[PDB]
Write a protein that binds this ligand. Structure first.
Ligand SMILES: NC(=O)c1ccc[n+]([C@@H]2O[C@H](COP(=O)([O-])OP(=O)(O)OC[C@H]3O[C@@H](n4cnc5c(N)ncnc54)[C@H](O)[C@@H]3O)[C@@H](O)[C@H]2O)c1
Ligand SMILES: NC(=O)c1ccc[n+]([C@@H]2O[C@H](COP(=O)([O-])OP(=O)(O)OC[C@H]3O[C@@H](n4cnc5c(N)ncnc54)[C@H](O)[C@@H]3O)[C@@H](O)[C@H]2O)c1
Ligand SMILES: N[C@@H](Cc1c[nH]c[nH+]1)C(=O)O
Ligand SMILES: N[C@@H](Cc1c[nH]c[nH+]1)C(=O)O
Ligand SMILES: [Zn+2]
Ligand SMILES: [Zn+2]
Lengths: 429, 430
């Protein structure tokens, strides 16, 4: 049975300890792999793939335009097309119109979007192969107009890339496919290799080694950034007495099954919830799951929290800062304004996280560990830089210049002042 | 005289070497900075005070003040007027970035949306090493104020003599706490919290290589903190053609050279007809009369002039270098805007010295350096926000989308994902 707490019973210290996650040192493990791929390129990459993935490969990088359109069972194709369609739509909707701002006459300022020229997209292939993720990452990259898009994916035992992953890659305009995983893949993209293009930003979810390699390389001389630490999946469910216990259980197990590293949280809000029934459903449903062993392992670090009301429930959720939040309560939409920290939100009774994981259109590459306090999930803007642009007329510089001179004086920065003064003297003549 | 290159003369290797900055490699700065960070982590305010004494030559007992406790400082009314114009322009440019939160409904009964939420607590580093920068306080605090961040800690090393212009801007932008500290010890105090300093979730702002390296380190720490960007030693790249007035070009190059010895400046000469000698005569002439000419000259020692056949070549090189600031002082500057790919902030034309952007045009001067303009944006309103995605399905919606979700979950080998849909659809069925 899942561990239980009551919020009023807890000291500040006990409460704050509930923010902690199950898994971890990783830098120590991962650093030598990164440096080795930095120094030795494709050769090291192949070796790392042999070691962990138990696959020997000579061609680790394929141009996607060279590879044939894979053939898919048509129900599978139809499903991934619905997903592509919904994700495309949700992300295309995020294009901001670039309005000029002119608050002083002759002082024109603006923002313009430019795509990151090359990006690397890590698509997990460990305990489960995730073409959903390929759509989550490649679709917004396609919309952004990124010129080089390298998608990394560790191969299957027979040396092959999952055909659903290749389908999505082609549909979203991925240019290069890196048949590699883990920290060796992340390092190959960050540094470039003989065959792998060097990227400017690395995206995507992964295991703790992938995640730690991402975190390391952002500080390296490779000159690379990342989206976020998007590690082991989490879900927090808030349920009231109207929620159907079996659906709640199903929802908790939907992400528990990802891995033993996952963490799940049930917040019971108000009176009237048959916690026993929920518990009975979790055990019942868990033991019939192919991945019930992983799920049970994940459940072992999961917990139930009882909250006197919905404001208290959502207040706790905000402290925990879950990757995913399912609000299964009466009038769930009305509580939306109290949500502060959550990567993605599922409101109501007909909105299992699964729809967001796969095809509602939102992005499932979301921050874990509590990183939802300051990071957003992947979005169109994750692939863009906003360059600010300004242009002054003579009149404009006559109006604004003297104030800039005053402020430069205050800061003790005479050259800053002179660049204005020199121009205003020239205008005077 | 400033080193000169011609692009046609260069091998790929020589060309790519022009991207390097005078900043020390990251591991070296990390070696210097790590012990300061760990020491503040472990030992708190006491450690911060020691490093302030050591580097800033100031002994202080109260490192954290509540802005609401401190009195409204009194300013020369010309100064107060200048900072108010700046506040106004910056507020306006940043407030303009509020995105209307449109719902998306591409399938009936599948509603998806984005909502903005402010980061609850933020730390804003305002430089005060070789020069005190209240401009930066506005650059960081104003968008924080617009975002609605609840705790706003502003860090600023105290002067040898808190700068009253820094406190003016802090009060005007709603800063809650003032941390009278600088460097890596300030950054660590904010990332970890101390006995008196609030723990923040995100750390912003520009600084020297130590500040910058401390930021970079702490994002990987167990503090659970993010940063805006590496916003290190100022850079400017000027593109000039034959219509540009040599003295203005010189003035512009020196405007950022004076920031410090580690700054880097680049002149790209585009096309024919540019009196490079006149530009150089102006740099030397103008540099030696500058209070900070010593810093500027040292920065000029790592700076260089590049000759490019035309404007397309000039802008192509600028994109490779990826400058923090780009001044395009050429005929029809605005028409080349679509070729700009990597630049933090852009100044078009002849009447737009970087200074206006540094101080009061309204754009944000906290911009990525070192080539990080290739993938990072300057600070903006969204830097202070998270966009939480939200979805809601009707029964009809789940009936329509659910089967596809089931198929995809099957493909991924994830049966529990499938069952969470299946279970709901069966109940709809009965
Ligand atoms: N937050 C998010 O956005 C998000 C979304 C989806 C999935 N996820 C998470 O991503 C995780 C992916 O893990 P995964 O392994 O399935 O995919 P993975 O691709 O991240 O890992 C496979 C690669 O990691 C390396 N690896 C695996 N086991 C190793 C070991 N013991 N030692 C060293 N290297 C090893 C291998 O080199 C291999 O190529 C899941 O647990 C899931 O919960 C997160
Ligand atoms: N990119 C941008 O957005 C931007 C904007 C404005 C300014 N800047 C830059 O900010 C920088 C400001 O630097 P500054 O030094 O004047 O002020 P600063 O506040 O960045 O740093 C000064 C502090 O550094 C610490 N320090 C000094 N020497 C040290 C050492 N040897 N080891 C460890 N710590 C040490 C001290 O605590 C001191 O308080 C300049 O380079 C300027 O160009 C960048
Ligand atoms: N739930 C995973 C995403 C996923 C992929 N496949 C199934 N689920 C996450 O967002 O962390
Ligand atoms: N030039 C600085 C900004 C600045 C502050 N004060 C003067 N200038 C930068 O953007 O890097
Ligand atoms: Zn999932
Ligand atoms: Zn400046």
């Amino acid at each position: 049975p899942i561990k239980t707490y009551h919020l009023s019973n807890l000291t500040q210290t006990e409460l704050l300890s509930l923010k902690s996650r199950p898994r971890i040192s990783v830098f120590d493990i991962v650093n030598p792999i990164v440096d080795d791929v930095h120094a030795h390129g494709d050769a090291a990459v192949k070796q790392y793939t042999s070691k962990f993935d138990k696959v020997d490969l000579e061609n680790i990088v394929e141009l996607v335009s060279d590879l044939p359109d894979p053939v898919l069972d048509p129900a599978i194709k139809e499903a991934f097309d619905v997903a592509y369609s919904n994700i495309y739509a949700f992300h295309a909707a995020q294009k901001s119109p670039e309005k000029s701002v002119e608050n002083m006459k002759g002082v024109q300022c603006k923002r313009v979007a430019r795509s990151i020229n090359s990006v690397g997209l890590y698509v997990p292939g460990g305990t489960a192969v995730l073409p959903s993720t390929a759509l989550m990452l490649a679709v917004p990259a396609q919309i952004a107009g990124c010129k080089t898009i390298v998608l990394a994916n560790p191969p299957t035992r027979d040396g092959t890339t999952c055909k659903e992953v290749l389908y999505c890659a082609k549909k979203a305009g991925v240019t290069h496919l890196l048949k590699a995983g883990g920290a060796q893949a992340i390092s190959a993209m960050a540094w470039g290799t003989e065959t792998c293009p060097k990227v400017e930003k690395i995206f995507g979810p992964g295991n703790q080694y992938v995640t730690a390699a991402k975190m390391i390389l952002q500080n390296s001389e490779a000159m690379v950034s990342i989206d976020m630490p998007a590690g082991p999946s989490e879900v927090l469910v808030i349920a009231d007495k109207h929620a159907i216990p079996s659906h709640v259980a199903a929802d908790l197990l939907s992400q528990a099954e990802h891995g033993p590293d996952s963490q799940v949280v049930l917040v019971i809000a108000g009176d009237g919830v048959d916690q026993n029934a929920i518990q009975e459903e979790v055990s019942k449903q868990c033991q019939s799951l192919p991945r019930g062993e992983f799920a049970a392992k994940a459940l072992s670090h999961s917990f139930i929290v009882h909250a006197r009301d919905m404001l208290e429930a959502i207040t706790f959720s905000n402290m925990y800062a879950p990757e995913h939040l399912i609000i299964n309560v009466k009038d769930a939409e009305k509580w939306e304004s109290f949500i502060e920290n959550a990567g993605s939100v599922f409101l109501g009774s007909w909105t299992p996280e699964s729809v967001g994981d796969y095809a509602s259109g939102t992005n499932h590459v979301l921050p874990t560990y509590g990183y939802a306090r300051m990071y957003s999930g992947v979005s169109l803007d994750s692939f863009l830089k906003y360059i600010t642009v300004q242009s002054l007329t003579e009149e404009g510089l006559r109006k604004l210049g003297p104030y800039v001179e005053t402020m430069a004086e205050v800061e003790g920065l005479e050259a800053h002042k002179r660049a204005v003064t020199l121009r205003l003297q020239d205008i005077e003549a």
